[PDB]
């Protein structure tokens, strides 16, 4: 009988199908992390800039 | 034989991409910890500004 | 062919080892992103809170100016 | 004897490889889902920051005038 050989082939078939999807997911995940990293960099800078502006105006108001 | 070798090659490539991704998510985590700290600062400063402005509003009144 | 089935088995073991590493990477990635969710939640909340206070603060400076004039 | 044993071993190996691959896929799909959700949250953050920039411009000018009036 060829039962074990056939199962090896069928298991490899399924492993190949999933593997294809894993590769696509890894690539997509990388691109998304790339995109979000630049977004996070900008968020950090903007947050800091706002914080400074707020402290400045708070100090100015204190004197009024 | 060739199908299995091709599969191995694809899996090895995917491991490489995922190792890259792990390094990237660490960079993302570091950035998020920093932004959380700064967003906390921002909330505090915003509240402080609100209060200070209110105090001037009452003063001018 | 015992040699041939033995050789293929060695290829399959290699595949299994590589998949084990790959699965560990996907697992670790998921965990790290779950952890990072905490940060994103707090950031969203703080920035939202900040925006509302700034809006209130500007409102106060407007009324202050109205009086000072 | 040894051929049958080796083939049985190969079957068991491929079964485990498939099981792990399916586990990896679940994890990866969850990860993308979460990254998408977090992207949406960060979009909200981005909008709020943009709004605060505008409000700080207004605040700068009101504070400036207040100082002039005192």
Swiss-Prot record, chain A:
Domain of life, per lineage: Eukaryota
Residue stretches making up the t-SNARE coiled-coil homology domain: 3-64
Organism encoding this protein: Saccharomyces cerevisiae (strain ATCC 204508 / S288c)
**What is stated as this protein's family in its record?**
Belongs to the SNAP-25 family.
- Section of the entire sequence shown: 589 to 650 of 651
What's the protein here called? Protein transport protein SEC9
Instruction: Report the protein's function.
Output: Component of a SNARE complex that may be the effector of SEC4 function in exocytosis.
**Subunit-structure text:** Interacts with SRO7 and SRO77.
Curated annotation (Swiss-Prot), chain B:
Q: Which GO terms describe its molecular function?
A: molecular adaptor activity; SNAP receptor activity; SNARE binding; syntaxin binding
Query: Which keywords has UniProt assigned to this entry?
Result: Coiled coil, Isopeptide bond, Lipoprotein, Membrane, Palmitate, Transmembrane, Transmembrane helix, Ubl conjugation
List GO terms (cellular component aspect): cell periphery; cellular bud; cellular bud neck; cytosol; endosome; endosome membrane; Golgi membrane; plasma membrane
How does this protein sit in the membrane? Single-pass type IV membrane protein
Domain (v-SNARE coiled-coil homology) ranges: 3-61
Identify the main location.
membrane
Give a GO biological-process term.
Golgi to plasma membrane transport
All ranges on the Cytoplasmic side of the membrane: 2-61
PTM comment: the record says: Palmitoylated by SWF1.
As for subcellular location, the record says: Endomembrane system
Q: Does the keyword Coiled coil apply?
A: yes
- The reply to whether DNA-binding figures as a keyword in the UniProt entry is no
Covalent link Glycyl lysine isopeptide (Lys-Gly) (interchain with G-Cter in ubiquitin), residues: 38
Function per UniProt: SNC1 and SNC2 are vesicle-targeting proteins essential for normal secretory traffic between the Golgi and the plasma membrane. They may also be involved in vesicle fusion.
In the record, the note on similarity to other proteins reads: Belongs to the synaptobrevin family.
The name under which this protein is listed is: Synaptobrevin homolog 1
The shown chain, on whole-protein numbering, covers 27 to 86 of 117
From Swiss-Prot, chain C:
> What superkingdom does the record give?
Eukaryota
Domain named t-SNARE coiled-coil homology is located at 2-64
Q: Where in the cell is it found?
A: Membrane
Tell me, in a sentence or two, what this protein's role is.
Answer: Required for vesicle fusion with the plasma membrane.
Similarity-based family = Belongs to the syntaxin family.
Additional info?
Answer: Present with 450 molecules/cell in log phase SD medium.
Indicate what this protein is called per its UniProt record: Protein SSO1
- Source organism per entry reads Saccharomyces cerevisiae (strain ATCC 204508 / S288c) (Baker's yeast)
